[PDB]
Amino acid sequence: GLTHRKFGGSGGSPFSGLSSIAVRSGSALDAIIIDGVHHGGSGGNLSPTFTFGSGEYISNMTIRSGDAIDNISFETNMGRRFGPYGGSGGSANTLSNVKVIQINGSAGDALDSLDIYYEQY
Amino acid sequence: GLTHRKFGGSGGSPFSGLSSIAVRSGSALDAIIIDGVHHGGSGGNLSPTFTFGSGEYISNMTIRSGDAIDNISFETNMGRRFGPYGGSGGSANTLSNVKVIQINGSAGDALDSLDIYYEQY
Numbered sequence: 456g457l458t459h460r461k462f463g464g465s466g467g468s469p470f471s472g473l474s475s476i477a478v479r480s481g482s483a484l485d486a487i488i489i490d491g492v493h494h495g496g497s498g499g500n501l502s503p504t505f506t507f508g509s510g511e512y513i514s515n516m517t518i519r520s521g522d523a524i525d526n527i528s529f530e531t532n533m534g535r536r537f538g539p540y541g542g543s544g545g546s547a548n549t550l551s552n553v554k555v556i557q558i559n560g561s562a563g564d565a566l567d568s569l570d571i572y573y574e575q576y
Numbered sequence: 577g578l579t580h581r582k583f584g585g586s587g588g589s590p591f592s593g594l595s596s597i598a599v600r601s602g603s604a605l606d607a608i609i610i611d612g613v614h615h616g617g618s619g620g621n622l623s624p625t626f627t628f629g630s631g632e633y634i635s636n637m638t639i640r641s642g643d644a645i646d647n648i649s650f651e652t653n654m655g656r657r658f659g660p661y662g663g664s665g666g667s668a669n670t671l672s673n674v675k676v677i678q679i680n681g682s683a684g685d686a687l688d689s690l691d692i693y694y695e696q697y
């Protein structure tokens with residue numbers, strides 16, 4: 456199953472492999488750009504990129520979805536916020552008091568799905 | 577606490593958020609560059625960038641570590657191989673038959689620690 460293992464010591468400043476998120480969005484999610492890699496189509500407007508600082512991670516996240524992704528918003532453990540971007544369709548699902556680890560999904564001309572890997576607190 | 581949740585529908589082509597890895601290495605790990613972002617110092621030599629192909633992922637990995645990261649090697653489900661890069665310090669830790677989902681860690685002037693998130697098959 457899903458698991459996590461740490462290697463090394465205690466020094467240094469923390470970093471996350473999930474380093475930046477942007478979206479293209481209109482009334483729905485046309486694309487998500489994860490660490491600079493584009494996933495989806497070219498519709499909508501390109502949001503400015505959210506780039507995480509050291510020790511910063513998504514701690515709350517609302518995704519509206521139906522047969523596709525309609526809307527994304529999140530807040531980090533530092534209190535910074537992204538979105539909401541997208542429209543009011545689908546229905547909202549919220550992750551509360553989490554640490555998002557990775558954002559995978561599926562995309563074509565639009566953002567069909569997201570697979571969110573996170574730690575639940 | 578580590579889990580995952582899927583939102584949205586069935587369409588599109590799958591994508592993974594972890595897309596490329598390079599390292600700076602000498603007798604140990606000086607830096608890791610994940611999805612294009614540099615974490616760590618300026619010592620050692622910069623490795624070529626390993627860019628994951630469509631549907632490719634780390635399936636087997638060895639990390640040598642003590643108080644820092646001493647060496648990294650991995651192999652993928654497409655038979656590709658990365659490293660070993662680094663030295664002989666620390667102790668070997670081996671992941672067998674996995675799918676690496678994400679790499680977090682900690683770095684200053686060197687690579688202090690790695691947090692590997694993976695599915696264990």
Ligand SMILES: OC[C@H]1O[C@H](O)[C@@H](O)[C@@H](O)[C@@H]1O
Nearest residue numbers: 480481482483484485498499
């Ligand atoms: O988000 C779906 C759709 O929303 C609006 O119609 C416009 O912004 C389009 O460009 C976009 O494709």
Ligand SMILES: OC[C@H]1O[C@H](O)[C@@H](O)[C@@H](O)[C@@H]1O
Nearest residue numbers: 520521522523524525544545
């Ligand atoms: O998610 C795409 C689309 O899927 C379904 O048709 C409904 O939930 C809509 O409200 C939503 O906009």
Ligand SMILES: OC[C@H]1O[C@H](O)[C@@H](O)[C@@H](O)[C@@H]1O
Nearest residue numbers: 562563564565566567587588
């Ligand atoms: O992403 C919207 C849509 O784009 C393309 O038509 C295909 O990839 C579909 O599978 C996908 O559902």
Ligand SMILES: OC[C@H]1O[C@H](O)[C@@H](O)[C@@H](O)[C@@H]1O
Nearest residue numbers: 601602603604605606619620
């Ligand atoms: O990797 C640890 C260390 O190895 C060698 O001594 C050199 O390449 C250094 O620049 C590097 O920092």
Ligand SMILES: OC[C@H]1O[C@H](O)[C@@H](O)[C@@H](O)[C@@H]1O
Nearest residue numbers: 641642643644645646665666
């Ligand atoms: O990890 C850096 C360093 O940490 C400890 O001192 C020992 O495990 C060494 O063998 C190792 O090289």
Ligand SMILES: OC[C@H]1O[C@H](O)[C@@H](O)[C@@H](O)[C@@H]1O
Nearest residue numbers: 466467468683684685686687
């Ligand atoms: O990365 C090696 C070393 O570099 C810097 O001195 C600091 O970030 C330390 O915490 C770290 O252990």
